[PDB]
Amino acid sequence: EVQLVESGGGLIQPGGSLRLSCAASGLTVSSNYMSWVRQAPGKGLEWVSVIYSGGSTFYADSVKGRFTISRDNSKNTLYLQMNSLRAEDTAVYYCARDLDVYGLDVWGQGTTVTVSSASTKGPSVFPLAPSSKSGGTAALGCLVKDYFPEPVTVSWNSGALTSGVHTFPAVLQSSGLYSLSSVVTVPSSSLGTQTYICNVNHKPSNTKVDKRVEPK
Amino acid sequence: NLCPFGEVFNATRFASVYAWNRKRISNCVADYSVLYNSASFSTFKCYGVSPTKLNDLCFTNVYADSFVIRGDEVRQIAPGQTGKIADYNYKLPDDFTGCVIAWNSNNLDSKVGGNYNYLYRLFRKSNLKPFERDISTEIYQAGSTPCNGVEGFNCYFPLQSYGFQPTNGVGYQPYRVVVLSFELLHAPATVC
Amino acid sequence: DIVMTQSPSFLSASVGDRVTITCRASQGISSYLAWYQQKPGKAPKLLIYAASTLQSGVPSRFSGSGSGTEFTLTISSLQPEDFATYYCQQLNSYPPKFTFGPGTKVEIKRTVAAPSVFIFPPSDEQLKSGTASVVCLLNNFYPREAKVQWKVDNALQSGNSQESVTEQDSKDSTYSLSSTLTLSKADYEKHKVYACEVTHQGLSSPVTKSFNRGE
Amino acid sequence: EVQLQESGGGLVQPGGSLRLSCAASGFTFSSYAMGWYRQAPGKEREWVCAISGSGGSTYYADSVKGRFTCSRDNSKNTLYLQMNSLKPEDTAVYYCARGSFYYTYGGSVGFDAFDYWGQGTQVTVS
Ligand SMILES: *[C@@H]1O[C@H](CO)[C@@H](O)[C@H](O)[C@H]1NC(C)=O
């Protein structure tokens, strides 16, 4: 019944334009306070904009003159037109229904908006090879370096190896690219017997790399 | 007779913004000096006239409107303004001729547990026309389902209560507001 | 402007305990306070409005108290699906319509576990590209608080390392950390000793793992 | 659907003359008073001037008095600031806005602007 379905997010260059849409079900957009709230990666929530039932619009200081809230009553859809986009605007944007003291009760799933001058790059896969430092546990892995945009998917032995696998969250480097680590701990007795291959898939660059990690 | 201005400012209890009070000043001589030489006021803004020239001016009628709002909302009592108060509670016309006077009332309209008698309209489908007073308590329909007079989801009471506490910040503190409108008509003038 | 603060930033508790988190305001905001819950990858869920009223759609174990500058969200008996981040939000503000707090993360408490420390030198493949990336791995530790220091020829490095932490593991509720020290091939070959020093609650003394370029 | 745009800026020698134009849409130009603001780099924005819709009453800052004249052609829905006898202290980005004149306790006059902003080319006197 009650839901807010969002769309329109994606990858954009600084100074670009985007239009986020939020289709409502179970509530009338024109009869409610409708708000846009964004969340930067790893950060908290920040109010972006609000539109009143009477047509009054209000914007946050960081988005005034660049963002525009709007609505279509026939389609019961909220709209956020984001112009003059900057890198600090990169975030997951949520559409919500505001009830003032009663709070924001209905939220959308959110749409991701990435603003970067970086170019779509395929990852480079490098081996984190096992070294000297018996039957004790030994760690190996793969380094997925210099890729954009997110995400990447990392598996081990075509999915046959899932226990002990730790795929770390990606970090944004100063170059604007993303780096990531995938590790796994195995019995050291299988270093010379069992093969270990990490499979890295980056769909935006159509990149698929199968790297076999050799003890060395 | 002297104009009934003290009976609006020195009033014991002020009205809610959704039910803002209006008094018709007529058949009297007005001394606006009791006003511009007073330090209780934090806002004394006059549009279309000078406060100093009011003593030498005559109007057919005066309208004194009184209510209580938040400090952060006193800016909304001005021509060409938006917000909950300006859109759904009290709207001033763009070509407004009159004065707006506002002072802090944290000593009068605040309570230790919170003064919940002062109310403002929260939900309204359309903006208020200038000088319109909506006293409707009808349940607001936030969806396509009719409310049938019962509260619930998408069915909310239109009026919400300020919680006026002495510990609140200046933006959340109560402020008493009086708006004087000066009306000149093709009729015998009664205020001078 | 009124500033929202939250205490603590990270809270560890088990299933069944009484959890109390606090939100503070610069000035009195009366009861214009709301409490939301957010899980990773999911939208925030409204729990409390008016600082004491439970939203239609919250279990009774959630409760909200407070007026003015101090507010508390309390879970009487913690449940497995309550391990998430909780935000306090001031309502009806100016200039912003509402202001969110930094957030408090509630996580699973368990026994203290010392990390397993490993070091990975740059691969010759990456070397040939003119860049070197040393990797330090801290595996299966608790609590999350851990200090990683890079050392190049016993010189404490700073400004050329980046850290990444996994979420609490679904099985053992342990964290894993990876620290990447990136430099150029020239500066990599200009030095010999490359070490990673780890400080954690479960370690009596900081543990250092090192390698020498050229094996 | 209110919009307002500014034009006329550029690099000018000290002592020169320049005219800046503010075009208006979404409202009746004659009904509302309009004002000129300058946002100097490194200071706060300062109110330069404002003119009544009739044009009978115009108020100027003491900084620009006797050198800058503010005019409006309500036929073209435009606001003009005649920047003449220019000085290097007059280098800033200039903005126009809609607003209402108000009188204070002593009869002093202030200008309160309806919130809006417009991208403009900096007016530099060099
Ligand atoms: C009314 O006026 C008297 C005398 O000036 C003053 O003491 C009192 O506080 C005023 N009351 C209100 C509500 O303004």
Residue numbers in the entry:
A (entry chain H): 1 to 82, 82A, 82B, 82C, 83 to 100, 100A, 101 to 129, 132 to 214
B (entry chain A): 334 to 525
C (entry chain L): 1 to 95, 95A, 95B, 96 to 213
D (entry chain B): 1 to 52, 52A, 53 to 82, 82A, 82B, 82C, 83 to 100, 100A, ...
From the paper:
Here, we describe the production and validation of a discovery library that produces single-domain nanobodies using an engineered human antibody variable gene segment. As a test case, anti-SARS-CoV-2 nanobodies were isolated from this library and pairs of complementary nanobodies were incorporated into an antibody-like molecule that targets the receptor-binding domain using a biparatopic mode of engagement. Our structures reveal that these nanobodies adopt a VHH fold as expected.
These structures use the same tyrosines (as YY in the YYDRxG motif) to form hydrophobic and π–π interaction with highly conserved residues in the SARS-CoV-2 RBD. The YYDRxG-like motif ([YY(D/T/S)xxG]) in the CDRH3 found in these three nanobodies was also identified in several antibodies isolated from different convalescent COVID donors. Neither of these biases can explain the convergence observed with the class 4 nanobodies, as the constant VHH region does not make significant contacts with RBD and the CDRH3 diversity was randomly generated using mixed trimer phosphoramidites during oligonucleotide synthesis. These data would suggest that the convergent binding solutions are more attributed to the geometric compatibility of this epitope, i.e., the formation of the backbone hydrogen–bonding network and aromatic packing, than to the presence of starting antibody gene segments. The epitopes of all five nanobodies, as determined by high-resolution structural analysis, validate the FACS-based epitope-binning strategy used for selection and engineering.
